[PDB]
Design a protein around this ligand. Structure first.
Ligand SMILES: Cc1cc2nc3c(=O)[nH]c(=O)nc-3n(C[C@H](O)[C@H](O)[C@H](O)COP(=O)(O)OP(=O)(O)OC[C@H]3O[C@@H](n4cnc5c(N)ncnc54)[C@H](O)[C@@H]3O)c2cc1C
Ligand SMILES: Cc1cc2nc3c(=O)[nH]c(=O)nc-3n(C[C@H](O)[C@H](O)[C@H](O)COP(=O)(O)OP(=O)(O)OC[C@H]3O[C@@H](n4cnc5c(N)ncnc54)[C@H](O)[C@@H]3O)c2cc1C
Ligand SMILES: OCCN1CCN(CCO)CC1
Ligand SMILES: OCCN1CCN(CCO)CC1
Lengths: 588, 588
């Protein structure tokens, strides 16, 4: 296995030094390379348990068993005397730059995963290019470098959520003694958008600086993989050229889906448009029941808007359905209207958007309920949040041999390798994986280290915690209650649960017995915690730390023996005692 | 060991049933006892690995080896036929009520620990009395049932902290698009206090109802332990009587210290007075540098007050001093003045408090700095926060034989037992233990289960997480960096750290590179996490979950392999990479 690891590492690293921490010759070479500004990976064999075996195995590549040993792109370059010879003869720069390809790595896609992968690879001397292109939405919306999360996802979404949370902060402040006249307080959408967009702009710019400062080539160009090592690029001017790369990372993400009904593309918008919308949405219909749908509906209602969500069947399919119902119940009790068991048939235009005065248009939405009654109501804005999908036939020619599944996502090994052995895929287009920004980042950074620094660590995609930033937030890590029961059987599952009330809600006169948490546990495995679920404020902060404990195999006894921090919401996880099977009420 | 456990369990339980989950005779007895409203502990031997040994060992108490076996106060009462005989002859109630003592348990002190202990004990049939008396402060302040945290500690402190946090919420709201005129917004102290006190009142009342509903006797009386089983009580009317108890729990807590300087008792106040203060403090001097001092100074300044903290030497002695300095720096940058290296000499009165119009008085504080310069400044309110101390010579006669340490705290075994074998101590008066409400609660609940339900589980007092609710909150779990270095040596310690910026602070134009976190790790123990530290918003929610992982022995690798929740503050713990020894800046 050492041999297989070493051969893969040598074949793939751009520039790599096999070293020992206590060798002056190893240090001679490192100082030369640093002085010449030559970035490289380093493997200190005296820090590896099988370093002595690695050292002997190196002779199969270099005919020598000593350190240091320098490799470039699979070729043994030399020991210390040889490296210094190249340097003193001004030959070293040419040696370390020789490649069959323009780049060691081409990343197609400049989002959460691709930027993380490209930046990390460049640290080890990989000559890296990152391609990013944002295809405009149907109304023409585009944005800068950084991907979905930065421009039209997690970042603006949570900032507008915070704008919404500040509404309840204004309400609460009076009860806590602050003297303010709410009846003169209103929200200005475009002032909020301008602040959000200024921050996004600082991220776009920061990423461009980051890539420059790491000697990564950034091309604002659409990339298309035409053969395993050839990426055809089309720039702003429609100029087409081809660049070649040793390793390719596909990191192209997804875009919103539209339903195939008249008027949807012409008159509706998606989340891609919402976060830079130059007019206030006004009275809004959200069609959809995903976390995007409910998050957007939620903050729009807390900003004072007249909001309706059209739900075909259930909320948050794939999430714990008890929690999903509690999430939606809170929203309905706090101003969000729900058109349940309802689907849209047609969007018709009644007024065009006012580009000069930044006012929405007006739309007539026709639909129908399962009981046969018709839905017909006017809205100023209609947001479709009915799923997202990859768009790879734009990005890889069918002839390259990269296998997709029936949803168009890339079929990968557990080390992100596609069916084309130099081509990898990370982030939302990697089939089967949780579609989250920190997953994409960990996947890309860890992959880059395996490709170019000899690492072995894989990304662990199990028990990845999430938070839905609805008006009352929902954090989760692990299995839903229903999935646990399906997998292990009802008799092997114990669920501990409790309502709770944040201390902050007491003086503010908010609800008893609405915030809620539970631990879904496996009886036959020492009451192992299979799933953790919390509905309450700051739910992402609550949940995150428990994800470490769940990764480590926490049991109910581990939660019990831990002491709470008081007064917090999270501490209630350390004193749960009511089981669902007991039938005792969880209210407090 | 089974024999020692069984003998202790039988001797101590008030009413206990040795049972098997699948015995109809065991169920006959349980239904009788439930019908007769006889509360008891139950031990299901068929759920214990050594139940068959326990079953045989029971014959040494009962001459029989079958289940069920019922015991009362150390006496075998009978099998099923005998218990039913007592019931059918109307003799059972008398049997289960016979005791050498008025109570199975007397709790002296109705605070966090004592209420938790008393309520839990009563669940197992322990006839329980809880005594609580609040000695008035020097200005006459008193309050109701529930202890320090409920009335004059964690609960009002965090509510006033929230009032302070809402100030920054009003500031932020404008940047997020809300239109409000701050120049007409002010804070009303007494409106806030009235809300806080209404909540506290609901807790006082809830505890009284809770005790009634659990058949606990609540005596609003000062208790004094005069012999191992005799508690002398003095009621509101100065009527003195004696009650007897089998087990005694001392749970009497501490009160604020005053320095011995002229005017301190006459003209200053403490936290005991602050949380119900009927006048606004106005321009305030806090003398002290504890978490109480800094928490109180912090919220008073965020409510708009003119606040100074007088610091003799350092902040937060006993806490990580890097974090303490960052905590204080934030406060100084946000309106809190610090009189450093300064001590008070004299408080003189310039105006008496206005009891009719609810306005503060006025005080002249004279003090001196270490460089010899004099301190002389006027304040409307002076708060002493210079430590807390037990007051047990009021509570136990010296002749009883309960050993105290040199600070007046009770010297306990690891199961809370004092040097008097039926007398236990929990909470703040238990020497050496973290002085926190959830510790007191876990200690009392777990002790009650050992005394009256045959449990063996001890309270684990190690790595107890904390949060200081200063304007920028500070959460911690485990060792300070300096304590780790002292214990293991600098060469065995690695510290990973980073600044961060909450997403909520971006649009709000708050500080870069002020929030901060670190993991203090042990190199020779697989990079075990010895201490976790975070300065930032919602720090108690951030910290809590990690305390489970630290309890389980988390390493740096366990943090790394866990995926972040984005966007949160807490996720930065999952991607730390800068070490202090590297010298690389932690800024971001
Ligand atoms: C509204 C919304 C809210 C969200 N909120 C959260 C949240 O709170 N927390 C969380 O963890 N996740 C959240 N997500 C998910 C997160 O945004 C994605 O998981 C993440 O962005 C995926 O990263 P990626 O690198 O796979 O793709 P992306 O970030 O989508 O980046 C892919 C980039 O490649 C570009 N591209 C596509 N094709 C090409 C091509 N041929 N050539 C060049 N460039 C191309 C794309 O235009 C894009 O810029 C949210 C998503 C949405 C839509
Ligand atoms: C300002 C302040 C803020 C705090 N904030 C926090 C925080 O945020 N989180 C946290 O975990 N901890 C906090 N604490 C600590 C917490 O309050 C204590 O750890 C906790 O209250 C100790 O509980 P206890 O049961 O030991 O004693 P107490 O809660 O003090 O209860 C003891 C009771 O016994 C009464 N008593 C005393 N003698 C007698 C007697 N002879 N007879 C009858 N009754 C008697 C006392 O008057 C009191 O009512 C704070 C403390 C203070 C002062
Ligand atoms: O989109 C469906 C995602 N789904 C929700 C999160 N789940 C994990 C937490 O319970 C798993 C899958
Ligand atoms: O009052 C001193 C308390 N002190 C602070 C908390 N510490 C633990 C977290 O680092 C331990 C002790």
């Amino acid at each position: 296995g050492t041999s297989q690891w070493l051969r893969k590492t040598v074949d793939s690293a751009a520039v790599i030094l096999f070293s020992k921490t206590t060798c002056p010759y190893c240090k001679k070479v490192k100082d030369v390379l640093a002085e010449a500004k030559i970035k490289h990976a380093t493997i200190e064999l005296d820090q590896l348990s099988n370093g002595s075996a690695i050292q002997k195995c190196l002779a199969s590549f270099s005919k020598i068993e000593t350190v240091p040993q320098m490799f470039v792109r699979g070729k043994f370059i030399g020991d210390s005397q040889t490296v210094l010879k190249y340097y003193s003869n001004d030959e070293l720069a040419g040696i370390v730059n020789e490649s069959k390809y323009d780049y060691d790595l081409i990343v197609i896609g400049g989002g959460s995963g691709g930027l993380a992968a490209g930046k990390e690879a460049a640290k080890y001397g990989a000559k890296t290019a990152v391609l990013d292109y944002v295809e405009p939405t149907p109304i023409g919306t585009t944005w800068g470098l950084g991907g979905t999360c930065v421009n039209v996802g997690c970042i603006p979404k949570k900032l507008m959520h915070q704008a919404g949370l500040l509404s309840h902060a204004l309400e609460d402040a009076e009860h806590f003694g602050w003297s303010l006249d709410r009846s003169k307080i209103s929200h200005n959408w475009s002032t909020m958008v301008e602040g959000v967009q200024s921050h996004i702009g600082s991220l776009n710019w920061g990423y461009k600086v980051a890539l420059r400062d790491n000697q990564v080539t950034y091309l604002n160009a659409k990339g298309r993989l035409i053969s395993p090592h050839e990426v055809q690029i089309t720039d702003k001017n429609q100029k087409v050229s081809t660049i070649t790369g040793n390793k390719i990372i596909l990191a192209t993400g997804e875009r919103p889906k539209y339903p195939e009904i008249p008027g949807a593309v012409e008159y509706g918008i998606t989340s891609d448009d919402l976060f830079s919308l130059p007019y206030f949405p006004g009275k809004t219909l959200v069609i959809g029941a995903s976390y995007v749908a409910l998050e957007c509906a939620g903050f729009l209602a807390s900003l004072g808007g007249d909001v309706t969500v059209m739900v075909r069947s259930i909320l948050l399919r794939g999430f714990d359905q008890q929690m999903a119902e509690k999430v939606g119940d809170y929203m309905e009790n706090h101003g969000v209207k729900f058109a349940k068991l309802c689907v849209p048939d047609e969007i018709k235009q009644l007024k065009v958007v006012d580009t000069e005065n930044n006012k929405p248009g007006l739309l007539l939405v026709k639909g129908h309920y399962t009981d046969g009654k018709k839905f017909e109501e006017e809205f100023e804005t209609v947001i479709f949040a009915v799923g997202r999908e990859p768009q790879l036939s734009k990005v890889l020619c069918e002839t390259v041999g990269v296998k997709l599944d029936k949803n168009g996502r890339v079929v990968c090994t557990d080390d992100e390798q596609t069916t084309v052995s130099n081509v990898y895929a990370i982030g939302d287009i990697n089939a089967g994986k949780p579609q989250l920004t920190p997953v994409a980042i960990q996947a890309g950074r860890y992959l880059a280290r395996r490709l170019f620094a000899g690492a072995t660590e894989l990304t662990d995609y199990s028990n990845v915690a999430t938070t839905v930033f609805t008006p009352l937030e929902y954090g989760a890590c692990g299995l839903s209650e229903e999935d646990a029961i399906e997998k292990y059987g009802d008799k092997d599952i114990e669920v501990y649960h409790s309502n709770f009330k944040p201390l902050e809600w007491t003086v503010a006169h908010r609800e008893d017995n609405v915030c809620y948490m539970k631990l879904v546990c496996r009886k036959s495995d020492n009451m192992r915690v299979l799933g953790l679920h919390v509905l309450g404020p700051n739910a992402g902060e609550i949940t995150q730390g428990y994800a470490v404990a769940i990764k480590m195999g926490a049991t109910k006894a581990d939660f019990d023996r831990t002491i709470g921090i008081h007064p917090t919401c999270s501490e209630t996880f350390t004193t749960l005692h009511v089981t669902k099977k007991s039938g005792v009420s969880p209210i407090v």
